[PDB]
Paper text:
Here, we used cryo-EM to determine the structures of heparin-induced filaments assembled from recombinant full-length 4R [name] ([name], 441 amino acid isoform) and the corresponding 3R isoform (2N3R, 410 amino acid isoform) to resolutions sufficient for de novo atomic modelling. Our results show that heparin-induced [name] filaments consist of a mixture of at least four different conformations, whereas heparin-induced 2N3R filaments mainly adopt a single conformation.
The helical twist of −2.03° for the jagged structure falls between those of the snake and twister filaments; the offset of the centre of the packing unit from the helical axis also lies in-between. The extent of the ordered core, comprising residues 274–321, is almost identical to that of twister filament. There are three β-strands, β1 (274–290), β2 (305–310) and β3 (313–321). Again, the structure is characterised by an overall kink, which, with an angle of 52° between β2 and β3, is the least pronounced of the three 4R [name] filament structures. Instead, one long, slightly bent β-strand extends from residues 274–290. The K280 side-chain points towards the inside of the core and makes a salt bridge with D314, whereas the K281 side-chain points outwards, and forms a salt bridge with D283. The density of the whole arc was not good enough for model building, resulting in the omission of residues 291–303 from the atomic model, and ambiguity in how the strands on opposite sides of the core connected to each other.
Author numbering:
A (entry chain B), B (entry chain A), C (entry chain C): 274 to 290, 304 to 321
């Protein structure tokens, strides 16, 4: 009945009174089947 | 009946009184089937 | 009956009293079938 894929990429700074966060070549596959 | 793919990319700064966050070549595939 | 793809790209600054956030070549494929 119900088939769900959820993919989230979170990127956040909280700078209060530089900053580097890199994602370098991500590859994502999601395989969900039924028989 | 119901087949859902959800993909979200979140990018956020909170600067209160530079900033770098890079995503570098993402590749996303979502494969959900039924038989 | 129901077949849904949802893709969202979020890009946001909150600057209160520079900023760089880059996405560099994203490739997205969404494959959902039925038999």
């Amino acid at each position: 009945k119900v088939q769900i894929i959820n993919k989230k990429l979170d990127l956040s700074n909280v700078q209060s009174k530089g900053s580097v966060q890199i994602v370098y070549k991500p590859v994502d596959l999601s395989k969900v089947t039924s028989k």
